[PDB]
């Protein structure tokens, strides 16, 4: 039983399985292991029939003893989190867990840390150093960093990215060790807790005078921020709780095409709530149009929805309906 290293035995298995199966195994391997067995099959020697048989038999035993679970190890987490705690908390926990697999070098920490901090850190860096740093990072992160530099340095870094010639290994190792030493500060992970969609939730609560003053102040400070806050403030769900008379009034103001486009993205409960109030002919033709018209881009649906939201706001300012968080109890 010749001193057949386990790496070379794995190389034997990869050779025996086939090309597509080898690619499938490669897709589930880490980079260091990929390079290791790539070198192993680069300096591969001949394998005897008996040693081949022994290796593949012991691999059969290992596969039989270990094969279990591994159904959707990654997708299962996403599906369970989305089903249990909603999309936003699912994404938050997914980011938290996928961040637990730490970097080995600070260069990848530059990928996981806020773009403003990166721009502040590497602005003083050498333009070629900036180029080398930006190449290793994710494309979106590099774009975010570059969007903060001034025009001259940004153009210089872009030009150097275009004509990169290849960094020496020792210099790259020194740069990596410098980044590791500097980024050795315990944890960056600036907690995302709080922000938009929470301010609107708060504003939905207090007195009309206070909230109108607050939104006026925000609009004075920033019009787009105020518009976003107002848009999140209402949310296109509580129209089911604006009762039937509001729907009856609203259909006197909403065009048919905008309503038809908007109802495509609406939930079945909201669609039924809107349909069940008007005349049979109107509800029937609206349902037939909804079932007949083809799919429409989401942005157009949101545009029509925002138009009817403007209509709703202009009609509520007149007091023709009541928009209340408190559910209308019927006895």
């Amino acid at each position: 039983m010749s001193n057949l290293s386990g790496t070379d035995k794995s190389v034997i298995l990869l050779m025996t399985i086939g090309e597509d199966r080898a690619a499938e195994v490669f897709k589930h391997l880490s980079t260091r292991e990929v390079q290791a067995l790539s070198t192993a099959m680069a300096n591969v020697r001949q394998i005897s029939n008996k040693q081949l048989t022994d290796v593949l038999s012991e691999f059969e035993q290992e596969a039989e003893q270990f094969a279990a679970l591994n159904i959707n190890a990654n997708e299962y987490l996403r599906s369970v989190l989305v089903k249990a705690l909603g999309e936003e908390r699912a994404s938050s926990l997914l980011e938290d867990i996928l961040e637990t697999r730490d970097t080995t070098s600070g260069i990848e920490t530059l990928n996981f840390m806020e773009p403003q901090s990166a721009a502040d850190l590497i602005r003083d860096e050498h333009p070629q150093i900036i180029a080398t740093i930006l190449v290793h990072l994710k494309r979106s992160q590099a774009a975010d960093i570059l969007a903060l530099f001034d025009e001259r340095l940004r153009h210089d870094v872009m030009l150097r990215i275009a004509t990169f010639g290849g960094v020496q290994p020792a210099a790259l190792a020194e740069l990596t060790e410098v980044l590791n030493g500097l980024l050795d500060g315990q944890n960056l992970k600036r907690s995302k807790m709080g922000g938009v969609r929470t301010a609107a939730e708060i504003i939905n609560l207090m007195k009309t005078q206070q909230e109108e003053a607050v939104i006026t102040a925000v609009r004075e400070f920033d019009g787009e921020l105020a518009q976003k806050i107002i848009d999140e403030m209402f949310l296109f769900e509580n129209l089911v709780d604006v009762d039937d008379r509001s729907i009856q009034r609203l259909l006197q103001e909403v065009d048919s095409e905008s309503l038809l486009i908007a109802l495509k993205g609406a939930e079945p409960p909201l669609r039924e709530k809107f349909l069940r109030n008007m005349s049979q002919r109107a509800a029937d033709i609206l349902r037939d149009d909804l079932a007949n018209r083809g799919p429409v881009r989401l942005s157009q649906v949101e545009n029509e929805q925002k138009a009817i939201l403007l209509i709703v706001r202009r009609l509520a300012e007149t007091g023709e309906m009541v928009i209340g968080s408190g559910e209308d109890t019927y006895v």
């Binding site: 794995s10 029939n49 691999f59």
Partner: protein
Amino acid sequence: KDEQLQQRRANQRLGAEVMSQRIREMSDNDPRVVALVIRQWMSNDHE
């Protein structure tokens, strides 16, 4: 003695081919499983 050796070699290669088809089926069934098995192998070279 030569014919016995050659037929023994033929039987060995036939069995190797058959169970190699078995590996091919297993790999197209659970490539993640064969991948984590070879992960065990990579971890245990160092022991």
